[PDB]
Amino acid sequence: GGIAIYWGQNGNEGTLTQTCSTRKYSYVNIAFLNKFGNGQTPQINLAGHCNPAAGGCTIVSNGIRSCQIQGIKVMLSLGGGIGSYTLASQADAKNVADYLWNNFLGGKSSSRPLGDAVLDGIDFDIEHGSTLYWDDLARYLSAYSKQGKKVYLTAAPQCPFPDRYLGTALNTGLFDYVWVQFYNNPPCQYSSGNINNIINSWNRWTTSINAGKIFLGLPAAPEAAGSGYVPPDVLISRILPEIKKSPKYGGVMLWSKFYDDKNGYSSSILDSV
Numbered sequence: 001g002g003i004a005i006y007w008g009q010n011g012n013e014g015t016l017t018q019t020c021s022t023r024k025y026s027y028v029n030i031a032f033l034n035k036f037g038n039g040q041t042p043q044i045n046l047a048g049h050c051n052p053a054a055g056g057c058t059i060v061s062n063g064i065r066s067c068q069i070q071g072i073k074v075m076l077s078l079g080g081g082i083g084s085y086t087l088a089s090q091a092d093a094k095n096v097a098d099y100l101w102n103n104f105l106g107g108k109s110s111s112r113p114l115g116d117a118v119l120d121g122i123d124f125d126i127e128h129g130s131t132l133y134w135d136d137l138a139r140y141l142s143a144y145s146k147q148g149k150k151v152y153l154t155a156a157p158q159c160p161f162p163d164r165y166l167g168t169a170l171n172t173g174l175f176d177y178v179w180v181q182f183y184n185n186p187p188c189q190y191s192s193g194n195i196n197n198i199i200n201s202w203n204r205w206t207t208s209i210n211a212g213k214i215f216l217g218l219p220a221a222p223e224a225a226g227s228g229y230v231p232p233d234v235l236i237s238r239i240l241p242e243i244k245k246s247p248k249y250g251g252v253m254l255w256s257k258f259y260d261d262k263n264g265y266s267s268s269i270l271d272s273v
C-alpha cells in the first residue's frame with residue numbers, strides 16, 4: 001500500500017511541493033482547520049507556513065496542484081489536538097459542509113483560504129468537543145459528489161474501538177480511508193516487546209467498520225507523541241507481516257512530515273508498506 005502523511009503543523013518541515021516531490025507519500029492531509037462550528041468564522045491554522053489573512057496561505061494551491069499531478073490525494077484535516085471546533089446542531093453540520101464545499105472543494109468563494117485548487121476531500125481528526133452531528137457532516141459532504149466530482153472522506157479515529165467522536169460517522173460506510181491512530185492510547189498501542197495490544201486492536205477495526213482501506217497510524221519519531229512509537233525494525237519484522245494479510249490493509253499513516261524528516265522513518269519502511 002502507501003504512506004499517508006500529515007503536513008502543516010511545523011513551519012520548518014518544507015513546502016507542500018517539497019513534501020509531494022519526496023515520492024514517499026500517496027496521501028497528504030493538510031493539518032488543521034481547527035476552529036469552526038457554533039457560529040464561529042472557520043479558521044485554518046498552518047503554524048509558521050503562512051498566515052491565512054489577506055490570502056497569505058493562497059500560495060498552498062501550488063503544492064496541491066503539484067501533488068495532484070503526481071496522483072497524490074490531498075485532504076483538508078478538520079480538528080486536531082488544539083481548537084474550538086464543534087457542531088452545535090444538524091443545521092450547523094449543513095452550514096459547515098457548505099462552507100467547506102465552496103472554500104476548499106468544487107463550490108465557489110472569493111475568499112478561498114488555500115487558493116484556487118480543489119482538494120480531493122475532507123479528513124476527520126475529531127478529538128474532543130461534541131460527539132454529535134459528525135455523521136450528518138459526512139452525509140452532507142458526500143451529497144456534493146452528486147454535482148459531478150468525488151469528495152473523499154477520510155477519518156483518523158484513535159485506536160480504542162469504538163471511537164466516541166467518530167464511531168457513528170464510521171458506521172455510515174461513507175469513508176474511503178481510515179487511518180487509526182495507534183499512539184497516545186496505552187491499551188491499543190505498542191509498548192516494548194508486546195505487539196499483541198496493537199494487533200488485537202487492528203483486528204477489531206478491520207473486522208468492524210465498513211470502509212475502503214484501513215491504515216496503521218503511527219508517530220514518526222519518539223518525540224512526536226507522548227507514547228506509542230514503534231522502532232522501524234519492529235514494524236517491518238513483527239507488525240506489518242501480520243497486518244498486510246488483511247484485504248482492507250491500505251498502508252501506514254505518520255504523524256508529521258516534520259518528525260518524519262528528523263527521524264527518516266519513511267526512508268526506513270517505504271518498501272515494506
Ligand SMILES: CC(=O)N[C@@H]1[C@@H](O)[C@H](O[C@@H]2O[C@H](CO)[C@@H](O[C@@H]3O[C@H](CO)[C@@H](O)[C@H](O)[C@H]3NC(C)=O)[C@H](O)[C@H]2NC(C)=O)[C@@H](CO)O[C@H]1O
Pocket residue numbers: 009010011012032034045047048049079080081082083223224225256
Ligand atoms: C508533538 C506535536 O507534534 N504536537 C502538535 C503541536 O505542535 C500542534 O500545535 C501547533 O504547534 C505548533 C508548533 O508550536 C504551532 O506553530 C506555531 O504557530 C504560530 C502561529 O500560530 C507561529 O508563529 C509559529 O511560528 C509556529 N511555530 C512553528 C515552528 O511553525 C501551531 O500554532 C500549533 N497548532 C495549533 C492548532 O495551535 C498541535 C495542533 O493540534 O498538534 C500537536 O499534536
